[PDB]
Design a protein around this motif. Structure first.
Motif, short mmCIF file in Angstrom:
data_model
loop_
_atom_site.label_atom_id
_atom_site.label_comp_id
_atom_site.label_asym_id
_atom_site.label_seq_id
_atom_site.Cartn_x
_atom_site.Cartn_y
_atom_site.Cartn_z
N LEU A 118 59.48 18.93 62.03
CA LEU A 118 59.76 20.30 62.41
C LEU A 118 59.05 20.67 63.71
O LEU A 118 59.63 21.31 64.58
CB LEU A 118 59.34 21.26 61.29
N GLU A 158 60.77 19.12 66.62
CA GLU A 158 62.00 19.84 66.94
C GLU A 158 61.69 21.11 67.73
O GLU A 158 62.37 21.43 68.71
CB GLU A 158 62.75 20.22 65.66
N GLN A 188 60.84 20.23 71.19
CA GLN A 188 62.06 19.90 71.93
C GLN A 188 62.88 21.12 72.30
O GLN A 188 63.67 21.08 73.23
CB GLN A 188 62.95 18.98 71.10
N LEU A 239 61.98 27.59 63.38
CA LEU A 239 63.10 26.79 63.87
C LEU A 239 64.39 27.57 63.63
O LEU A 239 65.32 27.51 64.42
CB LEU A 239 63.15 25.44 63.14
#
Lengths: 37, 37
Positions: free
Chosen positions: A30, A33, A36, B34
């Motif tokens: 996570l 991510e 990114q 996220l």
């Protein structure tokens, strides 16, 4: 009986460690991510 | 000692439980972040 009881805590300790591994790997995924994005 | 080996046993059990608790809490926040992205 402290043979079945000390094999029980063992199983609980084992399950907790599996849980720790799974969660550490997912949180790392996570974070990567988010990095990114 | 047996008493000073059982205490250790309870302390590592508590530390392991805390680690799982924190990893899950950290995980839920990471998922939420996220999710915003």
């Amino acid at each position: 009986n402290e043979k079945v009881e000390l094999q029980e805590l063992n199983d609980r300790f084992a399950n907790l460690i599996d849980k720790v591994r799974f969660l550490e790997q997912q949180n790392k995924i996570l974070l990567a991510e988010l990095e990114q994005l």
